[PDB]
Design a protein around this ligand. Structure first.
Ligand SMILES: Nc1ncnc2c1ncn2[C@@H]1O[C@H](COP(=O)(O)OP(=O)(O)O)[C@@H](O)[C@H]1O
Ligand SMILES: Nc1ncnc2c1ncn2[C@@H]1O[C@H](COP(=O)(O)OP(=O)(O)O)[C@@H](O)[C@H]1O
Ligand SMILES: Nc1ncnc2c1ncn2[C@@H]1O[C@H](COP(=O)(O)OP(=O)(O)O)[C@@H](O)[C@H]1O
Ligand SMILES: [Mg+2]
Ligand SMILES: [Mg+2]
Ligand SMILES: [Mg+2]
Lengths: 57, 74, 375, 375, 375
């Protein structure tokens, strides 16, 4: 039973480290995705102003 | 590890003699006489120190004397 | 025991021999690559006169037997140990003779010609084998991964191979082998533990600390920050219980042991870390496929069983390469056996049954010609 | 030491720096292009605090100093190494300051603009030099050859330039540079020797095997036939004695090392061999002068010191071109220094003394305008 | 007694403490590293109540005092013995306080961190010392040798260190310590003398036989041949006269005692002999400098005072290494004190006077930071 308990402790230590790394990676990927979305919408606003002046021609 | 504790005890031995002082329950006149007892403690302390100093000097002469004996019967 | 005439897949990887029949999903006979030699001479009567232990028989007794590694950095040192480990695997575990089925062996990339000719000669002349075949590990690992693109990083015990394969295409010019792996990490942990205070200088303890590393040692996500926060340790240091009972206390050393891979300067070698060498290899490839190599990088080897390698690789590559593209790193579960698994799925094809090398053609051609035929 | 106000000819060729005063027939200060950095940090007291070795001082100690190449393929990687090698050549060997005589430097064909502007700026702003001049190597080599017609093949250490000049006329459109030279040959020999069995992965051994190649490696007159006759070797394989004493045995590999030049496919590059690229360059020229280019082809570069290049070139060109005309290939003795020799005979003319670029006009014009003035 | 404000060089080597002022050529206070402790309790009145003897005071009386070794294999066992030996050296022989001059101590390579922090704390907190410095023995020995290249073999009493230094460059990765030295040789001689017939099991006799070994025991030039010719002894066996008067007769055992160094199997350890370990260390170094390490090998330690070590080393290395180069072994006279001598010449430099560690910075930083500053 001591061997089994030590095996379980290592298994969960591994799974918990995996949990923390996956959560950190998820947070980072969300940050990247929505920053990129913001950049896309910003260049969209640039196109909006550009078309407005082009109509102003 | 006990030697580190020995140095810690050296500081702890200096620490033991000092105790918290309370100036809130005392009035104007009593504090003065209490200051005087603190002063006498100071006096007392230096006296013993002085003694030690003089003894130290004496002891050093002893050492010197002792050394000569081993240099005369070798 | 076996009713199918199929090749025996025997992965003789450095540190662990994994043998089993083709078609299986995992090796049945898994034992370390070690040979135990009787050190002294006993006047006792009745014990086994066997002069050469192997495998679990040697692992069970490491205090009496001087331990010798049958493979070093990749180059085969002693051939008697080779004959011992194959003869043992054949006539002690599998309970089958090699005279009835083929044998698909797996060798490391960029190995000496003497090694290949020697093993082939022992497998043809001495043992009567109908057919042999040498295969590189990286291809079989990519097979088991279920893809055709990516750079396989195989970190065994004494050698580390980086092999790029894009669209099912090998690149023999870019394969660069570097002898940094589990043995140099065991040596680094041993010298730093000797620095801690517990000094040992025998191989049995070395194997014990190797097992301790396999069980506990992990990779750090930020080396210097972990050093600072471990200066005042609380939960960062762990107290391990030796199988003998002696209470060992190991703190930061864990996540500083594999760090030697990222900083070879610790062992005073001008070689670059595994990540930097892989990055340089990517520059050596063409630009067109570099993004695909970034998106399909695969890992192999037992050394990759440590927790925290994927994240460390991602941060290091992101710091080295631009951060505009997408650089996903994929590590298939049970990657260590994946190589062997590949062997199994490679031995069931009829075409592969047509690509074997029989005895007669080898005998007339000779071993060197056989080397030309394979590549 | 010098009583004549003449430019210092300093050929900074890739792999070997050759510096000397104008008028001489050979460079006095010849040292490899390498920079040795202290790898570790010593607690020792008294040794030179110098943090940057160079030249023979680095060659004498290659085990302690990590070696970095100051030039790669042609593009200058680090400028600190540039300042180090010139400052060393000025204040350690020649024992003369650049503030008293000009300096005729030689640069490779088709080099980056950043390289030229950088070296010119270090030679004008930092060091006080009365006048600078950049010159292409091919023209000076053709000068030293004593002709005005032919195609110069300059094979340095990391780059190979084919430059056609007919009747003294340069062709900046046909100059094609290809980064195949001595370093890629050293890498090929290293990987094939690792295939033989002796594996190394450090730069000091790389330089040692480079020297071994320079001394022994030659070009084959018939690759496949030599392969067949070397299969059963007797006098074809030679046993070399390493300067350390280890007995190395090298057979066919020698005459298969430079063969990579003729078959770039060995390094997995779509580029064509040096002979085929030269042949294509000849087609790119006009037909009228093609025969003259066939009859006046000249070679340059240290890599051409191998025995058997002239015959191999003759057979390959005869197999590619018709065999009706006459295709004589001329290689002047001591061709490697010939370039530098040219510099010497180019710095003694009064007209060339009138074609220098003084500080003031460069300062007002700026470096870019200086680039326009030269070409 | 001392009119110069210079550091006291106190080499606390295992087995013999050698203390003296800087500038001298030999230690004035030389005494064994032993602590004699009152075993019984006496009802007598008038004798010294001192509860802890040290040095010659303990050597003069070994029958009453149980002897304890203050150092074992390198790791400090008891710190009270440390405080005893320094306090004794300060206030019984040198007749000088540590509050007036620095102190340059010498420690063994690859020692525990606890040892260093402990000695530094006893030298700063308890004793008021203006400045401390820890130094490795190998560097000072190479200094006293008057060179900058070679591999120092320091064989003390309970530990043996092989330290390669080429062109004044330490190699902390190659330093390998092995606990085979004079104590294990004394134990081997004791058990083989017990096998001869004279059995003893007390430490005083152990020290006596240690002295007998130091005086008589030598190294053999050919072990098996000496065994054969000693089978019929005549002049090969010698009759020694014990200081007590008992007539001891010792024959071949002499030149078989240090042989255990060359064959650790005698003590049932898988470790390799000192010569084979040094040879392996040489392979671990780079090839370029290996010849220089062969030509500049230096020895240190009291154990090297036996006659016949140089020749044995030469034959063993010649049998192991090739016999084409030149392998000269140099042993400077009075090598044992050379280390200490180095200390003296190291404490007279003004720069070294600038590399000391004062109390205040250590107190704020703490001992661990001090460890980082030194290395
Ligand atoms: N379960 C494990 N956990 C951690 N490390 C391991 C494990 N199994 C093997 N290793 C390490 O991997 C190395 C051996 O790998 P190897 O068996 O050669 O991989 P492969 O068989 O994929 O080539 C050894 O250095 C060992 O320390
Ligand atoms: N004596 C020699 N024998 C063979 N090869 C040489 C020799 N000297 C130089 N080389 C090769 O030439 C290259 C360097 O040529 P380099 O000095 O740039 O020629 P150049 O100075 O004419 O431009 C290196 O790769 C080196 O291997
Ligand atoms: N004069 C001598 N002759 C033979 N052996 C000696 C002598 N002096 C010391 N030794 C041996 O050397 C060991 C102690 O060496 P040590 O004093 O530590 O050398 P170092 O001071 O150079 O480190 C002991 O085992 C002792 O047996
Ligand atoms: Mg592996
Ligand atoms: Mg050239
Ligand atoms: Mg010693």
């Amino acid at each position: 039973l001591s061997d089994k308990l030590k095996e379980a402790e290592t298994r969960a230590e591994f799974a918990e480290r995996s949990v923390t790394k996956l959560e950190k990676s998820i947070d980072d990927l969300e940050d990247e995705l929505y920053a990129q979305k913001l950049k896309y919408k910003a260049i969209s606003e640039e196109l909006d102003h550009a078309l407005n002046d082009m109509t102003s021609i | 590890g006990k030697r580190q504790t020995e140095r810690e005890k050296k500081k702890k031995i200096l620490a033991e003699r000092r105790k918290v002082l309370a100036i809130d329950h005392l009035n104007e006149d009593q504090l003065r006489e209490k200051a005087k007892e603190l002063w006498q403690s100071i006096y007392n302390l230096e006296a013993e120190k002085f003694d030690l100093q003089e003894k130290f000097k004496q002891q050093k002469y002893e050492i010197n004397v002792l050394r000569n004996r081993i240099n005369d019967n070798q | 025991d076996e009713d199918e005439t199929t090749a025996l897949v025997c992965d003789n990887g450095s540190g662990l021999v994994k043998a089993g029949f083709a078609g299986d999903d995992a090796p049945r006979a898994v034992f370390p690559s070690i040979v135990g030699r009787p050190r002294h001479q006993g006047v006792m009567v009745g014990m086994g006169q066997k002069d050469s232990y192997v495998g679990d028989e040697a692992q069970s007794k490491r205090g009496i037997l001087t331990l010798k590694y049958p493979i070093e950095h990749g180059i085969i040192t002693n051939w008697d140990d080779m004959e011992k480990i194959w003869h043992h695997t054949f006539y002690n575990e599998l309970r089958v003779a090699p005279e009835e089925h083929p044998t698909l062996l797996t060798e490391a990339p960029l190995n000496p010609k003497a090694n290949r000719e020697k093993m082939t000669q022992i497998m043809f002349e001495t043992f009567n084998v109908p057919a042999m075949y040498v295969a590189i590990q990286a291809v079989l690992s990519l097979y088991a991964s279920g893809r055709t693109t990516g750079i396989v990083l195989d970190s065994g015990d004494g050698v580390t191979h980086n092999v790029p394969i894009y669209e099912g295409y090998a690149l023999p010019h870019a394969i660069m082998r570097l002898d940094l792996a589990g043995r140099d990490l065991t040596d680094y942990l041993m010298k730093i533990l000797t620095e801690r205070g517990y000094s040992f200088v025998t191989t049995a303890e070395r194997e014990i600390v190797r097992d301790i590393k396999e069980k506990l040692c992990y990779v750090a996500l930020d080396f210097e920050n972990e050093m600072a926060t471990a200066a005042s340790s609380s939960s960062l240091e762990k107290s391990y219980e030796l199988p003998d009972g002696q209470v060992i206390t190991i703190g930061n050393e864990r996540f500083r042991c594999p760090e030697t891979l990222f900083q070879p300067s610790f062992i005073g070698m001008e070689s670059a870390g595994i990540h930097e060498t892989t990055y340089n290899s990517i520059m050596k490839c063409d630009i067109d496929i570099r993004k695909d190599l970034y998106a399909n990088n695969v890992m192999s080897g037992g050394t990759t069983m440590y927790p925290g390698i994927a994240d460390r690789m991602q941060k290091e590559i992101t710091a080295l390469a631009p951060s505009t593209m997408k650089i996903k790193i994929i590590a298939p579960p049970e990657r260590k056996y994946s190589v062997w698994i590949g062997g199994s799925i490679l031995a069931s094809l009829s075409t592969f049954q047509q690509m074997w090398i029989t005895k007669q053609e080898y005998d007339e051609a000779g071993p060197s010609i056989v080397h030309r035929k394979c590549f």
